[PDB]
Design a protein around this ligand. Structure first.
Ligand SMILES: O=C(O)CCn1ccc2ccccc21
Ligand SMILES: O=C(O)CCn1ccc2ccccc21
Ligand SMILES: O=C(O)CCn1ccc2ccccc21
Ligand SMILES: O=C(O)CCn1ccc2ccccc21
Ligand SMILES: O=C(O)CCn1ccc2ccccc21
Ligand SMILES: O=C(O)CCn1ccc2ccccc21
Lengths: 151, 151, 151, 151, 151, 151
């Protein structure tokens, strides 16, 4: 009866994201990954699903966007977002306060583990295009697809 | 004989802006709102004028842009800018120092009241388009026009 | 079966604190306020208890300190802390990462509401001693005791 | 009829401080330097007075402390504070919001010039004790007194 | 046998950049300025070369981009980058950590001198287009070319 | 003929420190760890020496303090300092600029590896006293001594 929504573009999902999903999943009864580019919708959904098989209380869903509306529709009142190096925290704070104002939804921030604290969807893609090895920072399902869209 | 310029795009003006205008207006002999998109020039001017009728020592003017040139032309030497959650303060500081360097103009920053600290022109528009209620964060003259550009 | 610990000195508890307690209480099955100076232990406990009567799933407890040990003893794995203006977030982040490292405990941060975002136990006391009125920022049970320790 | 108060310990006054005093003095009808340690009260007053002879509309006064009370007594509603490298801006912002809450007083922040942006009373003293030359960062009246309290 | 790479777009090179180049050049055996828009490639190369004649151990080179690959090819293991007001340090830190992860390359940050701390290629161009005088913040070779692309 | 000084209290030295020492040692001809409390001087020296046997070009020395004087005496012109989570970077920047002003010495900052980014001498001691296991974050020579000063 407790629930958190984890919203993002997830293009593609990274290990920093999965770290947060695991932590949300361990603290709330249900977690919903809301997928709000390099990969299309079902590729992103599939990559999230394939990377979260170990989390039975998590589900993935496309969202169309006011995150607070999505949260409110799912019957929840909490958003969970990760923090990593390069997160624009002032903007996240502005959105958190706006979201509480308009829909009464709370946002809980949690720091990603240090080893995954410097990956982001954008940087991983940019580095990947130029032949940098980011495979230790992304799930296998993502590495698999990233390799294909190279050769 | 004292004067401050409050520069911005004001697309649209928010209650965070009007809060700063009121504070400038109470500390300087004259305030000039310099309007430097969703709304066109006179819509923005009209919304600022309609939202500042209670400030007889404030006037609104379109500006074409080096803010310091505008300030210097008006016979003033001070810029007043607000700070809110999500303000890029490092960039504002860079511009403040550049502005002092090139024209000797000082920039005074003042924090918007907490209740209006999370609204910004951009976020208010984006939330408004998606049916979020931001009317408590914007002046009536703006809410009025925002409603029309919806229906 | 879900639970969060809200740790602090609470000397005295403020409305920013109670705001966070309410949000924790609404998202977790049990909340434990861990009280880790101007007021002594039971005064602090009493002020927290008196200010949280509307939260049946919250309890107050003195803690002796590694917060993670307290959390682990209570059968929980989550800490919830508020953020306000003046919070030393880099230090909170350092502690959050250390806490995850040593005991696997997650820390969730949530922003206090804007109206209570500038109060802190320290500043409220310092302002109170000098005759400033901070009563709108503190619970009645605290205002009551603060008045007495004045006259 | 406009006025700003510039509060601080000024132990001792630095060129970063005098830079702000000059900018306040040029934008307001009256400026009051409120002196709220290495030097005693009149040494600090004397050093401020000696360093501001070129500012006829500035006066120096000892203050006993809620700054807002001092401001309100002088008939003003504005505080002006400088920002330099190492300023704890989050704490200054917390105090600015508290000050507006309790007495309706506004606080205007202005960045000190780059050349004086790294001096602070504390660092100048600590460096001076260890024989570092900080004379280009402090007024002559201060350098004069600092030399004596060395030999 | 020690070496640092200083990467950037340098469009155009500023005195903040040359300050960092000088400091790198004084601490490492070789410095390579890697040029990764208003000016084309050889204009940028020429402006860097003309502004660094006093640095015999510095050379300029176009780079095609993973900076770490460029560094590794030159036989070095260090990147040197400047910090100025408005630098997005969190993003630089994210890239520094990613760069160490993928290629084992270290990044050393050094603060530009205060007098050049507020210039950036972008701001200098934008100010220059609008007739602001930024000549004290840019090398003569750049001022010379900037003047021409005006008249 | 190149050299960096790494200054600090090192009470005790941590793996975040040794990470920086290794990176300095790999980029400069000589590194000098300047030791400027829980452990006394030779305990700290011994712990640094024992933790740096793999760095032949590093030496340890007690310093008496203006760091810039120490640097200048050793014949060097560079300070190398690490950044970790909780570092007061604004204060480090203020000192870096002051140090350049008074002695022309440059300060290069480098980010500690993510896995050691949350340890600090202070936090490691405080956690250690309360029975937290920080052994993965400190060198064996330190863990050895920390164990003894427990039993
Ligand atoms: O927009 C996005 O996809 C990023 C938003 N986000 C959500 C969870 C999470 C965890 C770490 C870093 C960023 C995160
Ligand atoms: O570009 C803009 O319009 C914003 C610039 N600005 C000017 C006054 C003010 C008050 C609060 C927040 C931002 C503000
Ligand atoms: O040490 C303390 O008491 C403050 C720690 N803390 C815990 C909850 C909370 C909410 C807002 C601000 C600070 C808070
Ligand atoms: O407490 C203090 O004395 C510092 C407060 N302060 C007041 C004016 C000013 C200018 C630059 C830097 C700090 C300043
Ligand atoms: O992208 C760029 O060109 C800026 C990157 N950069 C490199 C050296 C340097 C010095 C001061 C400021 C920025 C700097
Ligand atoms: O005062 C101190 O000992 C810390 C100063 N310091 C020097 C190197 C280093 C590396 C990581 C973190 C802090 C560091």
């Amino acid at each position: 009866m407790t629930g958190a929504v984890c919203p993002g573009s997830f293009d593609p999902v990274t290990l920093g994201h999965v770290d947060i999903f695991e932590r949300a999943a361990a603290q709330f009864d249900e977690v919903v990954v809301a997928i709000l580019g390099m990969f299309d919708l079902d590729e992103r959904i599939a990559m999230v699903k394939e990377s979260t098989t170990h989390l039975p209380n998590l589900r993935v869903q496309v969202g169309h966007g006011l995150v607070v509306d999505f949260v409110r529709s799912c019957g929840m009142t909490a958003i969970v977002k990760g923090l990593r190096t390069g997160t624009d925290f002032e903007y996240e704070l502005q959105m958190a306060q706006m979201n509480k104002h308009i829909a009464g939804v709370d946002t809980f921030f949690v720091a990603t583990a240090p080893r995954y604290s410097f990956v982001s969807s954008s940087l991983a893609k940019e580095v990947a295009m130029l032949g940098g090895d980011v495979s230790e920072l992304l799930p296998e399902p993502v590495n698999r697809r990233l390799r294909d869209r190279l050769n």
